[PDB]
Each structure stands twice: as C-alpha cells, then as structure tokens.
Design a protein around this ligand. Sequence first.
Ligand SMILES: CC1=C(C/C=C(\C)CCC[C@H](C)CCC[C@H](C)CCCC(C)C)C(=O)c2ccccc2C1=O
Lengths: 740, 140, 47, 144, 150
Amino acid sequence: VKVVVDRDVVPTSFEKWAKPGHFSRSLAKGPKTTTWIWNLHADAHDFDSHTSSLEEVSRKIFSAHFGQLAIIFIWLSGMYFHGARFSNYVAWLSNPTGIKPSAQVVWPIVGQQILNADVGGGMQGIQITSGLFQLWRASGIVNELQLYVTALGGLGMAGLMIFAGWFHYHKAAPKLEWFQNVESMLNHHLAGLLGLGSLSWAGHQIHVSLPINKLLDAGVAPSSIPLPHEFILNRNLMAELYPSFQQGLVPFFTLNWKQYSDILTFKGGLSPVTGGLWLTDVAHHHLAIAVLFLVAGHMYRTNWGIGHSIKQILEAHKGPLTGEGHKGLYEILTTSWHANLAINLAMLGSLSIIVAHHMYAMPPYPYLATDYPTQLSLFTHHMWIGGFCIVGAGAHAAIYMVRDYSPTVNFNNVLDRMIRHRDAIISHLNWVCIFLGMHSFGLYIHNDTMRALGRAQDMFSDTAIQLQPVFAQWIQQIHTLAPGNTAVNALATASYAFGADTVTVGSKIAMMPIKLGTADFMVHHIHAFTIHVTTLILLKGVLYARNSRLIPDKANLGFRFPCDGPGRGGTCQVSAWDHVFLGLFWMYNALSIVIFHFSWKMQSDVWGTVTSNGAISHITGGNFAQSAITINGWLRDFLWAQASQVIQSYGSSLSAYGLMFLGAHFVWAFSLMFLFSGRGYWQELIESIVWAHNKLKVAPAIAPRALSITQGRAVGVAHYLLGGIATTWAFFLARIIAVG
Amino acid sequence: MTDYIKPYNNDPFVGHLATPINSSSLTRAYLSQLPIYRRGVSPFLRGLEIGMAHGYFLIGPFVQLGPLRNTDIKYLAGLLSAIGLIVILTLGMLLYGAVSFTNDSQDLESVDGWRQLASGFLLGAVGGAGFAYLLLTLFS
Amino acid sequence: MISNLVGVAVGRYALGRSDLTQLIASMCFGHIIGVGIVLGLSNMGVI
Amino acid sequence: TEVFSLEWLREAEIKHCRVAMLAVLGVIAQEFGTFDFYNAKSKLQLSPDLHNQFVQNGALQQILLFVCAWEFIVGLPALIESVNGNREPGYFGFDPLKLGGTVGSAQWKRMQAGELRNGRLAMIAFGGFFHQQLLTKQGIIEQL
Amino acid sequence: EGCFDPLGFTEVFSLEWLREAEIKHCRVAMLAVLGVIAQEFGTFDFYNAKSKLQLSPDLHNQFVQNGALQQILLFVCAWEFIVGLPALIESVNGNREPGYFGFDPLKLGGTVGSAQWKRMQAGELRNGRLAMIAFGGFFHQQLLTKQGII
Ligand SMILES: CC1=C(C/C=C(\C)CCC[C@H](C)CCC[C@H](C)CCCC(C)C)C(=O)c2ccccc2C1=O
C-alpha cells in the first residue's frame, strides 16, 4: 500500500495510428501477405503476445477495461434516450396492459414501414423485450424529462471514463506495485463497489418506491403523480404514505428497529397488484446485502496490519488428498492477469445463468411476469452470456498452463495433483458422460422406438409415473411448508412456483406451481449430459494444456496452433484452444437444450389464461405431458407448430423475425464451409485466381493467401454460433409475440 | 533430515501403493478373498463363482423392465432372455482363450486355466439363473 | 433505554480478552455483538 | 502531465474563454436595455421555451456553424508550428511583450500575468451564469 | 503521561502523508466554536436564539441561500492546501529556488539545535484530541428529550 505512480510513460501522438500494427514489430515490417491482415486483428487483443513487462501489460488491460467501460456507458445512455424521443413509455405508464412495449421506429424508404407494430399509445414502432419499461417503472420514472436528464447525465460519466483511460496512461500511470495490492483490491470491491453499491440503490428504492407502490398501484393518473422532491422536501408526505417516516432516524439509534416496518419487510412471494416481487421486500433486501458487504469488505491486509490476506489464507489450508494444498495460489492469481480471468469468467458466467433462473422463478420487476416476450428473452439472454463466459473461463484456464505456469516459481500441490493424476479426472468425467448419455438420450431413442413400434409406449405409462413425481417433489413440499414453520417471519414461499395450488393471476397468469412430470427428468438429464461433456472438454483443455502424453514438447507450439502433422497416425486439432472451439459447441448444445426446455415447458404448463367459468387454460394446454418423452414430439408439436407464428407474419408487423429466421440458417450453413474443408484445397484455389490476376497484373502486392488454419475454425465457430442463435432468437421472438 | 520426511509423508503416512480407490488395503485383500481371482485354487473354482454371481442377478432386469412385463407369463421372460444371453456370453468368453496363444507354458492365465474357469462359469450362470429362480416362488 | 445502552456497553466490554486487545477492532466488533444480542433479545421474543 | 494532451487542454481553455466573454458581453449587451424593468416579465420573449423552435433562426445558425467550422479549421493549423499564422501576431505581441517584460525585469511570464486566471474565470463564471438564469424555474428555496 | 506495557499508538499514519484531515483538524475546530459565539452579536435583527440555533431554527428554506457556493468554496479552499500534500510543491515558494534541496538544508533537527520545541505545535491537536471526547460529550444529550433549557 503506497502511492507509486509513474507519471508519463507513453506520449500522446498519432504516430502509432499511422503505422498499421505498431503493437508488434512482427506485424509491421512484413505486411506482404493476406494472412497478415487477419493476424493483425487476431492478436490485437492477445496482449501477452507483445511485451512481457507486466508493468506495461497491467497498463494495457486496465486501459481496455476503461475503454470497454466507456463503450458500455455509451450503450446505456442511449437506452434512456430511445424511451423518450420515439417510444410509448408514458402512455404505457398510464395504460400498461393494452399498450405493447415499443421503443424503435422505422423510416419510409423501401416500404419497410410494415415493421411499425401497432402497440398502442399513439406511437407505432418495433416491440422491445429488453425489460426497459419494467426497470424504468421500478425506478419511479414517469415523465419524459426524467429520461433526458438521465441521458445527458450519462454523457458526462461516459466522457469522464474516456478521459480516465486516457489519463492513467498517456498522462499518468501507476507503478507495478499498485497491482499486487489484491488485499487492498478486495477491500474496495466488496465494500466500495458491492457494499456502497448495494447501499446506494437501497437508499433509492426507499424514497422512490411510493411513486410506484403507494401511488401507481392505487389508480392515480401520471399527471396526478407528485414530484420525487416534493416527498423529500416535506417529510410528512412520506409520513402519511408510510406511518414510520415521522420518526426520521431516531429509533435507528435507539435500536427500536421494529418502528421501520412500513418499508422494511420480509413478505416473500409476489404482490397481487404489480405483477412481480414486493417493492418493499427488495429495499430491505438490498439493505441486508449492503450491511453484509460492509462487513465482508474488511478481510485483507491494508496498511494498518489487521486482517487476513490471500497469502496466508491459502498458505494455511491443507488436506490429506491435497498434500501441499492451497499454498502458492496467491502467487497464481497475483501474477497472471490471465489467472484472475478464468475464475472470474467461471463464477460470473454461472452467475448470469443463476440470475437468469432467478428472473423467471421470482419476477423482481413490476409487470414483468405477464410480459412473456421480455421474460423469455431475458432468461435465455443471460443464459447464453454465461455460456460464453464459462467457455472463456475454460479458454483461459487453458492459457495458464501454457503461458504462466512454472516448475520452480508458482506452486500448488493441488494444481500439481490436478496435473499429476490428470488422466484420472477426465477418465471419471468420461464414464460419467457416457452413462448420462447412453441413458438420457438412450431413453429418448427407447421411447421414440416404443411409440412407432406400437403398444410399448402404452406399457411405458407406469414408468412415466416413475422418476417424474418421485424426486424433487418433496423439495417443493418443503417450500410449501417452509413459511410459518421454518420461516415464521415469511407469509409466502420463495416463489409461487413452490406453493401448490396457489395461483396468482392479474388477468394473465404470472407464476404457477410448476408440477414436474412426464419428461422433466428426461430433459434435466439431457442438460446434465451436455453439462458434463462441456465441463469435460474444457477441463481437459485446462489440465492437458501443459503435459500431454502424445506430444511431450507441447509448451513449445502454443495455444492457438493448428496441429503437428500426419505423423503418429495423425496429430490433428490437439490445442487447448480447440478444446475451447469444440467446448463452445457443447456449451452451445447445452444452452440450446436448456433454452428449449425453459421456453416451451413454460407455455406447456405454466403460461396461460384464466376464466371464471373454468380455471386455467394454457396457451398450449398441457402438451408436453407426452410430447416431451420422445424426440418426435420435439419436432411434431414443438419445432413444427412454431412455423405458424414466424412465417404467418408477413401480413402483419412481425415479418423481420421470419427473414432473420430463414437467413440465420444461411450463415449457419455458411459455417459448414469452414468446418469441413481444408486450407490446402483452398490455397490451390487462390493460385488459379492469382493466375488470372497475373494475366492482367491485377494481382495485389499483398499476396493472396487462404485463411489461417486456426482462423478458419475461429470464423467457423463464429458462424455456427451466430447462425446458431439468430434462428432461436427469431423463434423465441416469433411465437411469444403472436401468443402474447 | 532432508525437508523433514516428505511434508509429513504426504499427510499421515499415505503409502497405499496398490490402493487408490482401485481396491483399499482392505478391499485388495477382499479381492484376494474374492473368488474371481482367488489364490490357492485352479480348475473350475476360479470360475464357477463367476457364473454363480452373474447368472444369479441376470434374472433381475427382464422380470420387471424387459420387453415383456404386463401379464402372468412374464416371470419366464426374465429367464429365457437371461439364459439365451448366457449361452451367447459363454461363447464370447470362451473365445478369448482361443484368441490367446502366447503363454502356452503359462496354462493358468492363458488357455488351460482360462477354460478351466469358464467351464465353471457355464454351470454357474445357468445354475445361478436357476438358483434365484426358485427364491421368489413361495411368496408369489 | 439505559438497559439497552448498557447492553451495548456490556456487549462491547465482554470483548476484552487476548484476541480483542487491538483498539478499534474491539469497538466495531462490539457493536456486532451488542446490536446482535439486542436483535436476539428484541424485547424478549424468543419463541 | 503529458505535452500534447495538456496542449489541447490549455488551448480549449483559451479557445472558449474569449467565447465565454464575448457571449457574456453579448448576452449582457442584448439585455442591457431589459435586465430590470419589472424583471423583463421573466425574460419576456427571450425565454427559450417561448421561442418557436427557432424557425427563422435555425437556417441562420446552420450558416454560423458552417463558417465557424473553417474558423476553427484555421485555428487548428495556425497553432501548429510558429510560422505564418502565429508568427506575425508573434512579433506583434512581442512589441507589447518587450515593454511588458521591461516592466517585469528579466521576462515576466505573461501566462502568470493573466492567461490562466482569465481563462478559468470566464469558464466558471459562464457556467454559473448559464444555470442561474436558464436552469431553474421553481426556486423553492430563496437563492442568495 | 502514565502508561506501561499495552500496545496502542497515539496519532501517526502508516504512510504518514495524512495531512488532509490532521493538519486542518485544529483549524476545522476554529470554525466550530464560531457557532458557539454564534451569529447573534447584539441589537439589530438577531439571527438565532437559544439552544435550538443549529437545526430547529435552521431556516425552513435552505438548499440555495444556505450557499451551495458557500459549501462549494470550502472544497475549493481545501483543494489549494489539502490536494497539494502528497508532494505537489509549487514554484512560487521561495527565492533562488533552483536546486532547492541544496540551498538551506533542513534535516532531522534532533541534534543540538532547536532544543525543547514542537511542544507548542503538538499543543493544539492535543486540544483537538481533547475536543473529540468533549464535543460528543455534549452531543449525546442532544438526541434526548431536551426538556426546558437544555
Ligand atoms: C473460403 C475458404 C477460405 C478462403 C477465405 C477467404 C478468402 C476469406 C475472404 C474474406 C474477405 C473479407 C473477402 C474479400 C473482401 C475484401 C476484403 C474486399 C473488401 C473491400 C470492401 C468490400 C470493404 C479458407 O481459407 C479456408 C481455410 C480452411 C477451410 C476452409 C476455407 C474456406 O472455405
């Protein structure tokens, strides 16, 4: 802990921009090849492939942090603008049901004005599924002026970060000593960012809740809504809307906390007025998280001598099967900028998935559960984000054994054992994958056989009673009896997906006691199969990245290399980056099956309508009580009946989701050009075109060459994913708008 | 005293050379006690128990889950499929000794003792399918 | 009241052993033990 | 701290301090006859919200933004190097600069005489002059 | 000045470049007792009366006339002194400033010269440290019922 700054290290000059490839002398003197054009961008972000001075690598990544951060701020500042200039948020603020969301308009140029979906509120445009209107309503924003002020205030913060990432660099620069303060870093991330962040937003939704809770839920017009400062300038207004504000931080010191029970509660479940979680439970929630982070943010050595440290914490954890356990992990994470990134990408990637689950389970925003397109889109959105992030965790946990692991410096006998008995880890995961594959998908082959064969599916009904409602049923029953018993201070469950027979409806079903059955054990094990295979191939790329049995001199070649050659029968695609390239694909299959499961099972048994003459009638009424057990039902009643909502939309305003649907198969099958052919044939293909180019001398000085062997696969997975997401992106956004 | 006796002998005196979950020091002795590779015995007995263990449970799967499981005759479908697979599996296991032909001096683990344990495996599998056959009859 | 202020005072003075003799840490953690016991007391709710 | 960045910083200060002074001496000049006199009926028609979205002044502002562009496209290279553009005002200023230096001994650095104070006073005063009169409708609390 | 074996440090900062609060803590208390003398001085329209002074008669309307600039300028005044304390020495200080470390060396001062001093210097923050016990000593009672005169 010391202010060690290296003021002025790199000057501010356009000289480097004049040279295409100033970041590497190898990518500057010889731009005579087409391959150099692609190498300039492939290595543009591989900062450890330029200079080795860590004082400069740390002063090239924190710059990219502020750069990406500025890009994100430019991105967020526009969202508040689009919901004010051309949108329907104010009309939707008055009438939330009949007015569909929209915040994007088209222009009359080539007849594209058909995309102007009639949403209502005196404004036509394109429907939105980003949850912007729910977030803005939960923030107390009503007038358009409050949008523009936030946007103009976002421009300032966006500019300050550009003048900051251009400050600690071309102007200032901390030394290398400022980065080994990981102890001082977690004391400011868990307390300054997480702590003060969970406290600052907590103090907001306590004084901004009543413009949403005790006003917009009563039935007052948006014009009759008072001003947020009129409630603060007069404490008695808050006192009347909540009879606890008369005190004004007096029992807070007296420890008479029960007198603050008008805003701070632990109700649970959802509110039968808004459509999501309670607006008072989240305020108390963030207060509870804020204090916990104010405590957890004081755990490591600053410059006063008290507290633990990542050093001796890991230097103390042992274990019989670990040997010299946990020691040296401090030197693992404090030396390699890479090393922090895999554990970050892993935790944050699983975090995006877990928060995606928490979205649909308990809807935290008002008018979010009924908004089916937004809910369906947001879950799978963070779902695929975490898929990419966890594979990036594998992508870099593979980088570590190759780029920053030494048999003399940094040492954990735990990681040593992960590489010493490395052939055992993957052997276990291999047999687990095969057992979960020959059965989970084996049972799919089995049931699809039983139906086309005849009376076998009839005798499978008793087994359909097995597995399903056998496990996890008691867990839901625990949560039914969890309030009152194991939760005396909770008058509702964690979510209405747990409370049996308890259905909350606001003209449209919000949540349902998700009665498992028929084939949830099937798809959950298809998930576990595609999860164990993904973990297997990525962990394989992690621990086999250093020591390999086939080729012993593995560290010499690198990370993003093609292979070795036709020897040994054939060494092909053996890099850890290829275990990530294929790891992206099994993650792709995993997340694809999970989004299919979530999306369709929702309208199967959860999403529906309600009438007084009856009870519950789903959009698609209880179909996957049989159409999920076999593979056919996944394209007989699932992938087949969806064409009636994506194609039957040219006569309406949903025509773009059909064009993108049919056009995403184009780029996906365009990936089938790179993932199947080889550079040898294509390189023989250029030289003929180069012959025609030498006939008229129209041959470029930059010698035409084929794509790199690794770059072709990188573009192949790029198209296999882009063409393999935009189809379901157009599909998830197809039916849910027609059946909304 | 170099490094003080290998950081505590790699924690409380591990050792365990032929143990790491393949068979604990108790389980490796249990394998020597196990008849499939039993010490101090030869012709028939190294097998025999192999069949008396395999064919004994081969009746299990097809009694409750097999392609025939919904009438009163289904008590036989668990045995016919089992015995048919027993004949097939006996042929498949006997053929291994025919494929091997290098250790004709080591008659035990190659050809002689190999067939002189599969010979017990045939009677063990068929008989064991008949042993668990008469076990669930008195309760039905 | 006085019983609650002395409750925090005894909850901060019950933290004066060998592992607590380090000034400010004994005071802050005292409130953690103080308010917490009060919240465990909470005008005697228990069960 | 670096050269080429602080160059644009000190320049922008000078390139707007004169703008933040001719505007003050322009907004005050246009309202010198209507500052008080019953507070000009709360700025009278000079209230920006009362203007008709600048119907007649929009096409004029476009012409102004055009000419002002090349004006600063002359300020960008005239700063580059000393010769031509800045060199002739260079020795012009050197005529008062020599007398000012004679009054101030060895050299008397003119930038300490009043290049930064005027530059920052104009910016801060015009920033506050634009908020008190153009960014407050309801006062709530008395402003003193 | 009576103590024995226990561990405990009076004042001192580990990095010891904490002049942002330490240097002004005796000066910040100068404008604290300004409120003790308070705004009323005798005759004319009195600004405030009795123990209420600070917040009961804090004026109903006070987010502007209680100067934002008045609070702003405090920070601006602090920036001149408090920001410039890591090092941030300016050229204006001194005559014949070139090679300033060589001219008129300072050094520790423990040797022979400048004997028996800094007692005066240390004297003020002693009162500032006295003040922290004494200040809140009157502040605990402010929360309570405050019957009559108190
Ligand atoms: C096509 C193909 C190539 C060749 C790929 C090429 C030539 C990429 C072409 C992409 C560029 C961007 C197209 C050329 C466009 C020029 C850049 C000109 C653009 C100028 C304006 C339009 C901006 C391989 O190298 C290859 C390698 C291994 C397996 C399969 C394949 C394979 O299928």
